[PDB]
Design a binder for this molecule. Sequence first.
Ligand SMILES: Nc1nc2c(ncn2[C@@H]2O[C@H](COP(=O)(O)OP(=O)(O)O)[C@@H](O)[C@H]2O)c(=O)[nH]1
Ligand SMILES: [Ca+2]
Ligand SMILES: [Ca+2]
Ligand SMILES: [Mg+2]
Length: 166
Amino acid sequence: MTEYKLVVVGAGGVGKSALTIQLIQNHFVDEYDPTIEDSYRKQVVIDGETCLLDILDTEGQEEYSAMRDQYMRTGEGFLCVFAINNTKSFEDIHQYREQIKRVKDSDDVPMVLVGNKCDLAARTVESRQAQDLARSYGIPYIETSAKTRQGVEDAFYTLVREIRQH
Ligand SMILES: Nc1nc2c(ncn2[C@@H]2O[C@H](COP(=O)(O)OP(=O)(O)O)[C@@H](O)[C@H]2O)c(=O)[nH]1
Ligand SMILES: [Ca+2]
Ligand SMILES: [Ca+2]
Ligand SMILES: [Mg+2]
């Protein structure tokens, strides 16, 4: 079956690990902290075709690591995650998209913009803001909650669709 290397990026605390854990383990655990910055494998059926998702859950690295750039470079599609209650994390999306563009040597990498923690009423980033940005980038925008499961599988499956139709 086709394997898809998916990479999850974004500021610390936005829910990258929780999104991955929801997809892989089908639960949400407050404040859980993975211990490996590892990859996760899941066999899924998307639009009738079985495939293997290989998910890289990134941690924040503030300096230069050629190894970390090479792990990113193996990725075929990227989730750019911010949290809808965290204005700073939305402002950070630009630097993550620039990083992917640099390491992939391409401006048009399969990508989905993800606004996580949509269960929280205390929104500071309006959906229209992210919709505008996603449309400027030419990529889908999906709102998720790793806590309630809303949008989680759709974010990953939409990313695969973006790879398939790239
Ligand atoms: N309410 C809510 N909390 C979340 C959600 N996703 C993650 N969290 C919590 O936000 C904190 C940071 O999440 P984490 O997965 O470690 O973010 P990461 O640093 O991007 O990997 C943790 O306490 C999570 O339990 C969500 O969708 N809704
Ligand atoms: Ca944490
Ligand atoms: Ca596009
Ligand atoms: Mg994490």
